[PDB]
Design a protein around this ligand. Structure first.
Ligand SMILES: [Zn+2]
Lengths: 97, 110, 31, 114, 326, 135, 198, 160, 36, 102
C-alpha cells in the first residue's frame, strides 16, 4: 500500500470511518463521490455538505483554468466541466427547503 | 564642526612616536586583584544562574511606596520556566555612536 | 639546503622519545 | 509506529468478516478504489518524443504515471496495460501499452519512438 | 608634518642583537600552524598542526617529547596555562579541548562554537579561557563548569587572535573586519574599537612587561596601550608580506612572520624594523610554500620558535640597521 | 541581571505594605510575546482577584506605562489617548507581527511620546500647551 | 566509422561539456562509443594537436627517433608534439533522416541549460503568476461586491511585509536635524492616496 | 514449573532500574522539555566520521579566500571570491589527475598561494589515505564507502 | 543550482533552551593547579 | 496594477521576494541597493531609508551603498536628511576620498 491512497482505502481505515459515521456522525464528504440524482437525500445536512463539496470543486476548477498555456485543450475541456459543476450546484439549490 | 568633533586628529597619530621613554605601566597589582575579584564574582554568578536555569536536578519599592517581593515554590512537575519556548529573536544593533573607521593614504597584474 | 649547511642542526623526529603514559607536569604534595 | 510493525491495533469489537463486509458496502460509494488510472512510478523504456512540444524524453527517465487496465487482453489470460506519462515542458498526456507478443511496448497516441 | 619627523629623527632605538637560525625540527607531517611554550619552566613547547595532532618538543635537545591525538580536523591554536596544568587546544573541528598534563589526556571538550575555532587565550589570572572562531564571536568559558559564561557580540566577521589581559580590557580580539576590539567581559560589551587597520588583522600579541598589544594587518603593524585603547606606534612594515605571526619578546623585540616567510624583527615601541631574514625550505619542498605561520618566544626571550609551512619548526638564536623614516 | 517592575500608584493599591511574588520568565508579554518575569500582587490580603503584570518591563519603558494598568505612567491615560494629546500639541505604531514586535520591544527608543511623558520638563510643557489650547 | 556532422557535434559538446566527461558526449552521438569518442577527439578534434604536415628537418628527426626507439610510437609522437597514427603513416611513407534528428536533439541539448529542477522551478513560478492574475481578474469581475485579496498562508510565524515595517533600522538622530522631512513624506503620501482612488 | 524464590532476580532488576533512573530523567525529562520548549539553534559536530572531509574542505577554502583578501586591493570582491574558489577547485582537480595547473592570467603570488594550499591538501589527503589503507589491512572498522574511496584514492596515487 | 558555496558563518544569541545535554553533565569539578 | 489592493498585493510579494534573497546572501550589497531603489519607486521613503540603513549595518565599508543612499535622499529633495547622512558617512569613513567630494 505504498503512495498513501492504498493506506487510506485500507480495510482498517474504512472500518474506522464506518464506526465514526455510526457513532457521532463523522462523515467525510470529500471521501465519497457526490451522488448523481438528487432527491435521494432526505436529510438537509447531507445535502448542504454535498453542495459545499461541489462549490469547492468548482473553485478548484476555476483556479486552474486561468493558467498561462491557455491554448491547450485541457483548459477548453474544463470550461465544459466548469459549466457542468455550475449546473450541479444549481440543482443542489433545489426548493424543497 | 560636528563632523570635526566626531573624528579627531590624535586618533591617527601614534603617541609613542614623539616620546620614547614614555611607557605604559603594567597595571597595579592591587588593581589587577580587584579586577579579578569583580570578574570572578560576576562570572561565578553567571554560572550559578545558568545552573539554576538547567532543568536537571543537582525587598523592593515602586515610587515612594515600599513593597515585598517573594518567589513562590511552583509545583515540581510543571515546567520550571513556563515563559520560555525557544523563540527566534532578531535584535537591532542599536549602535548610536559612530565608529571612526580610520586609515592612512600595477592594477593589471593583481 | 641552508638548514642543512653551516653549523645549524636539522633534527628528523618521527618517534616520540619520552613514553605516552608519562606526565608532562607532576603534582607531588607531601610524602 | 515503525515500518516493520508486526500487529496493528484493532478495537475490542472487530468482527473481521463483518468489517470486511462493511468496507465492501462502503467501497462502491468510495471515491478512490472505485476509479481507473491508479498512479504508478515508472521509468520510460521507449525513449521517445512528446508529439506536441517535441521534448525528447530519453530512456530510463522517471515519471509518476497512471497505470490503467486495458479490457481487451492479449490472447486470453495475460493482461496488458496503458501507462500514462506527461511531457516535462508541455502537459500532453503521452502513454503506451505493453503488448507481450514481442516482449516490448506499443505507443498509444502520445509520442513516437526513436 | 615637520614637527614630528624631526623629533623621530632625533630619537634613537636600542641595538637589539640580530637573529640566526639554530634549530630546525622537521617532525610534523603538516603545517605547524600553532606553537606554544610553558609559562612556568621553558622545557617543552607544543605545536598543533594540519597533521591533526599536536606534538610536544623539548627545547634544549629539540627532541619530540610526545604526541597528542585529540582532534579530527586540524589544530588552529593552543595555550598552556600558567595557573593550572592544562593545555587548551582548539581545532577547526569546532572543539575547544582541554588536556590534563598530569595524564596527557583530554578532559573537558567545551562545546558551543558553531564553526571552526581559531584561537584560545587562557585568562592569566582567572580559571577561565576565551575562544573565538569564524563564528564572529569570542566566547569565554568557565573551565570548571565547561560552559560558555558570556559571549562577545560586537564583531562583524571571523575573529582571529583573541588575547587575554588581566586588567579591565580583559580581551583583545582581532577580526577580518580589521577592527581589533577591547572588551569588558563584566559589562557584556565593548569598551574601545581600534579600527586603524586596512585589512584583516590576522595577528596580534600582548607585550609581556608593557601592557600593550601589537597587531598586524596585511602590512602595517600597529601597536597600542589598551589602558585607554589608544595608539602607541606604527612599525616600519612598508612592503613586508601578509603578517601571519606577531609575537613579542620580553626584551622589546617584536617579531613578525609573513606569508613570504621573511622573518622580520623590530624594536618594540620604536617602530623600527631592525632585521629581515630570508626563509628556507627543504630540497623537496617548493619556494612558494615556506612561510612562518605560527611563532612565539620563550619566557626568557633568547629563543624565537617559528612554525613554518615546510612542516618544520625553526628555533632562532641571537650592527643594527639605519633608521630612515618616510 | 534584571530591571525593576514599573507599577503605578493607583494600579498597585492604597496600602503601606503589599506582598508580591516574582515568577521569572513567567509569561510572554502581550505586546512583544517574549518571556519576562511576572510580578503578581494581591493588593489587600483578602480582596479577591490578583493583579498580574501583563507586559515586559522593556515594553512598558518604551510606552511609559504601568505594567498592570497599561496606562501612562504619569497621567494614567490609555496609550492612544495620551499619545493623541501629544500629537495634537505623532503617535506610536505597535507593529502587530510575530517577529517584528519582538524586535520593536528590544529597541530601547521610547517608541513615541513616551520620552515627553517621562521627563518633568517635557510632560509639564505639553500640559501647559494643552491648557493654553483649551483656553 | 565517423561522419563529419557527428564530429562537429562532438566538438561542440566538448566545448559545452569537458574533455574529461566522455559519457554525456557519447550519449549525444547515439552510435559512437564513450571510450571511442575520447579517442576520436584525441585524434582529430582538439586544435592544439598539429595534424598538418611539416618541414624536411622534422621528418628527418622523426625517422631518427624511429631508428633509436624501435617503433615505440606513442613516445615518438609525444617527442614530436604530433599525433601517433599520422606520424606512423609519415614514417611508412618515408542516414540523412538520422542526421536531421540527431542534430535537432544535439542542438536542443547544447542550447538548453536546463533539466528537471531548472525547468520545473521557472514553470512553477509561471503557474503562480498565472494564478495571481486569475485572482485579480476575479476580483475585477466582482468589484461591485466588496472583495479582499487573499494573503499568502503563513507556515511558521512570518511577516507580511506590507504592515509592521519589517526589522527597521533607525534614521539615526543627527546634529543638523530639520523637521521638513516629515512634511515632505506626508506630501509624498498624499499623492499615493490619489493614485489609489484612480 | 513452580520454583518460587524470585529474590535475587528482583534485586538485579532493582539495581538495573537504578542506572535507568538517571538516564530516564535526562532522556524522558529532555523529551518533555522539548515538547514544551523545542530547541533553537543546535550545533553539529565534525568529530563525526561523516561530514568531516567536507568541513575540512570548506575551512581550507575559507583560509585561501582570507589569504587572497590579505594579498591585494579589490573593488567588489565578493564576485571575485567565487572565481578564486573555482580556480582553487580546478587546481585541486589537476593535482588529483596529475595535470600541471598552469594558467597564464594567474598572477605569481595568488597562484603560488593556491599551489601551497593544494600541496597542504595533498599532504593531508595522502596521509589520510595511507592511514585508511593501514586500517583496512588490520581489519579495523572501515566504512564500505570509505574503503571504496581508499581504493580509488590509492589507485590514483599509484597512477601519479 | 543551489549546491552552493558560502560567504560567512553566524553568531546570534537567543533565550537558552534548558535541555540536559549528555556532555554538559558535571565532571572534573576539581581544577588542578601549579605549585607556586 | 489597476486597484490599490492589487498594488499592495504586488508590492508585498516583491518585498517578500527581496527579503528571501537577503536572508541567504545578506552580505551581497547589490541586492540591498536594488531593494532600496524598488522602495523609492514605490514612494515609501521610510521603507527605502530603513533598507539602506540595514545594508550599511551589514557592510559599513562599502562606498557604493553610501553614495546610492545619499543620492536617494537627495532625489526626494530631502536635503537636510541627506546632509545628515553624508555627515554620518564622513564620520564613519574619513580616509575614503569620495564621501567628502560628494
Ligand atoms: Zn497601573
Amino acid at each position: 500500500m505504498s503512495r498513501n491512497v492504498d493506506k487510506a482505502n485500507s480495510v482498517l481505515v474504512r472500518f474506522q470511518e464506518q464506526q465514526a459515521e455510526s457513532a457521532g456522525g463523522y462523515k467525510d464528504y470529500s471521501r465519497y463521490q457526490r451522488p448523481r440524482n438528487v432527491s435521494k437525500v432526505k436529510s438537509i445536512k447531507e445535502a448542504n455538505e454535498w453542495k459545499r463539496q461541489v462549490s469547492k470543486e468548482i473553485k478548484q476548477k476555476s483556479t486552474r483554468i486561468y493558467d498561462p498555456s491557455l491554448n491547450e485543450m485541457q483548459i477548453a475541456e474544463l470550461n465544459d466541466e466548469l459549466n457542468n459543476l455550475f449546473k450541479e450546484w444549481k440543482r443542489w439549490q433545489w426548493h424543497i427547503d | 564642526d560636528q563632523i570635526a568633533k566626531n573624528v579627531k586628529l590624535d586618533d591617527f597619530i601614534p603617541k609613542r612616536q614623539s616620546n620614547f621613554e614614555l611607557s605604559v605601566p603594567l597595571p597595579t597589582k592591587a588593581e589587577i586583584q580587584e579586577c579579578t575579584a569583580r570578574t570572578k564574582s560576576y562570572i561565578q554568578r553567571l554560572v550559578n544562574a545558568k545552573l539554576a536555569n538547567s532543568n536537571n536536578r543537582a525587598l523592593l519599592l515602586n515610587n515612594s511606596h515600599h513593597i515585598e517581593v517573594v518567589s513562590k515554590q511552583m509545583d515540581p512537575l510543571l515546567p520550571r520556566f513556563v515563559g520560555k519556548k525557544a523563540r527566534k529573536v532578531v535584535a537591532p544593533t542599536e549602535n548610536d555612536e559612530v565608529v571612526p573607521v580610520l586609515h592612512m593614504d600595477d592594477p593589471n597584474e593583481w | 639546503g641552508k638548514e642543512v649547511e653551516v653549523l645549524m642542526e636539522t633534527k628528523n623526529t618521527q618517534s616520540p622519545q619520552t613514553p605516552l603514559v608519562e606526565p608532562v607536569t607532576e603534582r607531588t604534595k607531601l610524602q | 509506529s515503525e515500518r516493520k510493525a508486526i500487529n496493528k491495533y484493532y478495537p475490542p469489537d472487530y468482527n473481521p468478516l463483518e468489517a470486511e463486509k462493511l468496507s465492501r458496502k462502503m467501497a462502491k460509494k468510495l471515491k478512490t478504489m472505485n476509479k481507473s488510472h491508479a498512479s504508478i512510478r515508472l521509468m520510460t523504456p521507449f525513449s521517445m518524443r512528446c508529439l506536441e512540444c517535441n521534448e525528447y524524453i530519453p530512456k530510463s527517465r522517471k515519471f509518476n504515471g497512471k497505470k490503467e487496465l486495458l479490457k481487451e487482453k492479449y490472447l486470453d489470460s495475460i493482461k496488458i496495460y496503458r501507462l500514462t506519462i506527461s511531457c516535462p515542458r508541455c502537459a500532453n498526456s503521452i502513454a503506451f501499452r505493453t503488448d507481450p507478443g514481442n516482449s516490448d511496448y506499443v505507443m498509444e497516441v502520445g509520442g513516437v519512438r526513436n | 608634518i615637520v614637527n614630528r619627523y624631526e623629533k623621530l629623527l632625533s630619537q634613537r632605538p636600542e641595538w637589539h642583537a640580530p637573529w640566526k637560525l639554530s634549530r630546525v625540527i622537521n617532525g610534523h607531517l603538516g603545517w605547524v600552524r600553532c606553537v606554544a611554550i610553558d609559562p612556568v619552566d621553558n622545557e617543552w613547547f607544543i605545536t598543533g598542526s594540519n597533521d591533526t595532532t599536536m606534538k610536544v618538543w623539548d627545547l634544549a635537545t629539540g627532541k619530540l617529547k610526545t604526541t597528542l591525538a585529540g582532534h579530527v580536523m586540524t589544530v588552529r591554536d593552543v595555550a598552556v596555562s600558567d595557573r593550572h596544568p592544562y593545555l587548551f587546544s582548539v581545532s577547526e573541528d569546532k572543539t575547544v579541548k582541554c588536556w590534563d598534563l598530569e595524564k596527557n589526556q583530554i578532559i573537558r571538550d567545551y562545546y558551543g562554537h558553531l564553526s571552526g575555532v581559531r584561537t584560545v587565550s587562557i585568562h592569566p589570572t582567572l580559571d577561565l579561557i576565551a575562544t573565538a572562531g569564524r563564528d564572529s564571536v569570542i566566547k569565554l568559558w568557565d573551565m570548571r563548569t565547561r560552559i560558555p559564561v558570556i559571549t562577545l557580540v560586537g564583531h562583524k566577521g571571523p575573529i582571529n587572535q583573541v588575547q587575554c589581559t588581566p586588567v579591565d580590557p580583559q580581551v583583545v580580539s582581532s577580526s577580518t573586519d580589521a577592527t581589533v576590539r577591547l572588551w569588558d567581559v563584566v559589562a557584556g560589551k565593548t569598551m574601545k574599537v581600534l579600527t586603524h587597520h586596512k585589512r584583516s588583522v590576522r595577528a596580534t600579541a600582548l607585550h609581556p612587561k608593557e601592557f600593550s598589544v601589537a597587531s598586524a594587518c596585511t602590512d602595517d603593524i600597529r601597536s597600542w596601550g589598551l589602558a585607554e585603547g589608544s595608539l602607541l606606534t606604527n612599525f616600519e612594515s612598508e612592503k613586508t608580506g601578509i603578517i601571519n605571526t606577531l609575537s613579542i619578546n620580553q626584551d622589546d623585540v617584536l617579531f613578525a612572520g609573513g606569508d613570504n616567510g621573511v622573518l622580520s624583527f623590530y624594536d618594540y615601541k620604536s617602530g623600527h624594523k631592525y632585521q629581515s631574514l630570508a626563509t628556507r625550505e627543504m630540497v623537496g619542498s617548493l619556494e612558494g610554500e615556506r612561510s612562518v605561520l605560527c611563532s612565539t618566544f620563550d619566557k626568557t626571550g633568547l629563543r624565537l620558535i617559528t612554525g613554518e609551512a615546510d612542516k618544520s619548526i625553526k628555533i632562532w638564536k641571537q650592527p643594527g640597521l639605519a633608521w630612515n623614516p618616510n | 541581571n534584571e530591571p525593576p517592575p514599573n507599577i503605578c500608584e493607583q494600579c498597585l493599591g492604597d496600602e503601606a505594605n503589599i506582598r508580591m511574588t516574582k515568577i521569572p520568565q513567567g509569561s510572554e508579554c502581550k505586546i512583544c510575546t517574549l518571556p519576562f518575569t511576572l510580578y503578581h500582587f494581591k493588593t489587600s490580603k483578602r480582596s479577591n482577584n490578583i493583579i498580574k503584570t501583563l507586559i515586559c518591563v522593556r515594553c512598558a519603558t518604551q510606552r511609559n506605562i504601568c505594567q498592570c494598568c497599561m496606562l501612562d505612567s504619569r497621567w494614567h491615560i490609555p496609550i492612544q489617548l495620551r499619545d493623541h494629546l501629544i500629537s495634537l500639541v505623532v503617535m506610536t505604531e505597535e507593529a502587530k507581527n510575530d517577529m517584528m514586535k519582538r524586535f520593536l520591544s528590544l529597541k530601547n527608543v521610547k517608541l513615541g511620546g513616551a520620552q515627553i511623558t517621562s521627563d518633568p520638563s517635557e510632560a509639564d510643557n505639553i500640559v501647559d500647551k494643552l491648557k493654553n489650547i483649551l483656553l | 566509422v565517423w561522419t563529419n556532422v557527428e564530429d562537429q557535434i562532438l566538438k561542440a559538446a566538448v566545448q559545452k561539456y569537458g574533455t574529461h566527461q566522455w559519457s554525456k558526449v557519447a550519449s549525444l552521438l547515439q552510435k559512437k562509443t564513450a571510450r571511442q569518442s575520447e579517442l576520436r577527439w584525441n585524434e582529430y578534434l582538439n586544435p592544439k594537436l598539429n595534424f598538418t604536415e611539416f618541414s624536411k628537418e622534422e621528418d628527418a628527426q622523426l625517422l631518427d627517433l624511429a631508428r633509436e626507439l624501435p617503433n615505440q610510437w606513442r613516445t615518438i609522437a609525444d617527442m614530436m608534439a604530433r599525433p601517433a597514427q599520422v606520424c606512423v603513416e609519415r614514417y611508412n611513407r618515408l542516414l540523412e533522416d538520422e542526421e536531421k534528428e540527431m542534430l535537432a536533439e544535439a542542438r536542443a541539448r547544447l542550447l538548453n541549460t536546463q533539466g528537471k529542477k531548472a525547468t520545473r522551478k521557472i514553470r512553477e513560478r509561471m503557474l503562480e503568476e498565472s494564478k495571481r492574475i486569475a485572482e485579480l481578474q476575479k476580483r475585477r469581475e466582482l468589484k461591485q461586491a466588496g472583495i479582499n485579496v487573499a494573503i499568502k498562508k503563513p507556515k511558521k510565524k512570518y511577516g507580511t511585509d506590507i504592515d509592521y515595517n519589517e526589522d527597521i533600522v533607525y534614521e539615526q538622530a543627527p546634529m543638523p536635524g530639520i523637521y521638513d522631512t516629515s512634511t515632505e513624506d506626508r506630501q509624498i503620501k498624499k499623492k499615493f492616496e490619489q493614485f489609489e482612488r484612480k | 514449573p513452580g520454583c518460587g524464590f524470585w529474590q535475587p532476580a528482583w534485586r538485579v532488576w532493582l539495581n538495573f532500574l537504578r542506572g535507568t533512573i538517571p538516564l530516564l530523567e535526562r532522556y524522558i525529562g529532555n523529551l518533555i522539555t522539548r515538547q514544551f520548549e523545542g530547541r533553537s539553534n543546535e550545533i553539529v559536530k565534525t568529530t563525526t566520521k561523516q561530514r568531516l572531509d567536507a568541513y575540512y574542505d570548506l575551512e581550507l577554502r575559507n583560509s585561501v579566500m582570507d589569504d587572497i583578501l590579505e594579498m591585494m586591493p579589490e573593488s567588489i570582491r565578493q564576485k571575485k571570491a567565487r572565481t578564486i574558489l573555482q580556480h582553487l577547485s580546478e587546481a585541486w582537480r589537476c593535482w588529483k589527475a596529475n595535470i600541471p595547473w598552469d594558467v597564464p592570467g594567474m598572477p605569481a603570488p595568488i597562484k603560488k598561494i593556491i599551489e601551497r594550499y593544494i600541496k597542504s591538501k595533498a599532504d593531508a589527503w595522502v596521509s589520510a589515505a595511507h592511514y585508511n589503507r593501514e586500517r583496512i589491512k588490520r581489519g579495523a572498522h572501515v566504512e564500505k564507502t570509505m574503503v571504496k574511496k581508499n581504493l580509488g584514492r590509492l589507485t590514483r596515487l599509484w597512477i601519479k | 543550482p543551489q549546491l552552493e558555496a558560502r560567504s560567512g558563518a553566524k553568531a546570534a544569541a537567543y533565550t537558552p533552551t534548558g535541555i540536559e545535554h549528555a556532555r554538559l553533565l558535571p565532571g572534573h569539578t576539581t581544577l588542578k593547579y601549579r605549585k607556586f | 496594477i489597476l486597484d490599490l489592493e492589487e498594488l499592495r498585493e504586488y508590492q508585498r510579494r516583491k518585498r517578500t521576494e527581496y527579503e528571501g534573497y537577503l536572508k541567504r546572501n545578506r552580505l551581497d550589497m547589490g541586492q540591498w541597493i536594488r531593494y532600496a531603489q524598488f522602495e523609492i519607486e514605490q514612494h515609501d521613503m521610510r521603507r527605502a531609508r530603513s533598507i539602506f540603513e540595514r545594508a550599511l549595518l551589514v557592510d559599513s565599508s562599502f562606498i557604493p551603498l553610501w553614495i546610492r543612499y545619499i543620492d536617494a535622499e537627495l532625489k526626494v529633495k530631502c536635503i537636510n536628511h541627506a546632509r545628515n547622512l553624508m555627515n554620518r558617512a564622513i564620520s564613519t569613513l574619513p580616509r575614503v576620498d569620495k564621501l567628502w567630494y560628494k
